[PDB]
Amino acid sequence: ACPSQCSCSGTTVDCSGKSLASVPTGIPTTTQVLGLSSNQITKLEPGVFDSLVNLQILVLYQNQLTTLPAGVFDRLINLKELYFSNNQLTSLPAGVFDKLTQLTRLELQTNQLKSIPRGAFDNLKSLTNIYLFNNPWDCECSDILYLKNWIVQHASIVNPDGHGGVDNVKCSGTNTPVRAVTEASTSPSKCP
């Protein structure tokens, strides 16, 4: 059955724009597309998505999330697209994307991210487009070096489709490109 606060169309569950603070309980396990955008979600509980083994698209755009619980996406082995822009994310858990081998699209723009955990994208061997602009990347901290190395390596897939490319991943304050950060200019002690 469709959750009372959402609208359902086939295997798509549209819970967007309903002033929700919580993900509904009892989303059908056959769901392939889950829209949660434009709500009031500030915190996801551990395991909130574990049932959604058939999910291919997850939309969390325009909420107020600041962190994620460890393992939150681990059961989403069929995910192809993750739309997580326009939240307030300040960090990502280690390993958070490790199970998303089919992911082609990852949207992280317009958050509060300072760095990406080392190796976070290691298993994303289908990824064709990632968005990272409009985050206050902390280029004084040595934690930035993985992101720098990864965007330099994979420059063609960063911020495509008119979003400024690899150069639009910018250091907070100085506004210089993250891709130009040198190891010697960073410090492990200048890390919040």
Contact 171, 137 (CB under 8 A): yes
Q: Identify how the structure was determined.
A: X-ray
12-14/129-131 β-pairing:
unpaired
Contact 102, 128 (CB under 8 A): no
DSSP per residue over 1-65, as a string? ---TTSEEETTEEE-TTS--SSPPTT--TT--EEE--SS----PPTTTTTT-TT--EEE--S---
Please give the backbone phi and psi of residue 158, each rounded to the nearest 5 degrees, phi first: -95, 125
Classify burial at 131, counting beta carbons within 10 Å of its beta carbon; exposed 0-12, middle 13-18, buried 19 or more: buried
- Token pair 């460890």: residue: 70
First to last CA, the chain: 45
Please give the backbone phi and psi of residue 132, each rounded to the nearest 5 degrees, phi first: -135, 0
Strands, sheet with 81-83, edge to edge from the N-terminal-most edge strand = 7-9, 12-14, 33-35, 57-59, 81-83, 105-107, 129-131
The alpha helices in 76-155, defined as continuous H runs, are 145-153
Domain boundaries, the chain: 1-192
Q: Which two tokens stand for residue 65?
A: 């999330």
In whole angstroms, what is the distance from residue 109 CA to residue 130 CA?
9
Classify burial at 19, counting beta carbons within 10 Å of its beta carbon; exposed 0-12, middle 13-18, buried 19 or more: exposed
In whole angstroms, what is the distance from residue 137 CA to residue 109 CA?
11
What are the C-alpha distances in Å from 181 to residues 150, 156, 169? Answer: 12, 18, 11
Of the candidates 84, 133, 139, the residue with the CA atom closest to the CA atom of residue 114? 139
**What one-letter code names the amino acid at 96?**
V
> Is residue 129 helix, strand or coil?
strand
Contact 138, 192 (CB under 8 A): yes
Q: Which two tokens stand for residue 80?
A: 């192809």
CA atoms in the 13 A half-sphere facing the CB of 190: 13
Contact 143, 120 (CB under 8 A): no
129-131/81-83 β-pairing:
unpaired
Of the candidates 22, 74, 71, the residue with the CA atom closest to the CA atom of residue 44? 22
What are the C-alpha distances in Å from 148 to residues 75, 138, 151? Answer: 29, 11, 5
Of the candidates 83, 99, 81, 87, the residue with the CA atom closest to the CA atom of residue 32? 81
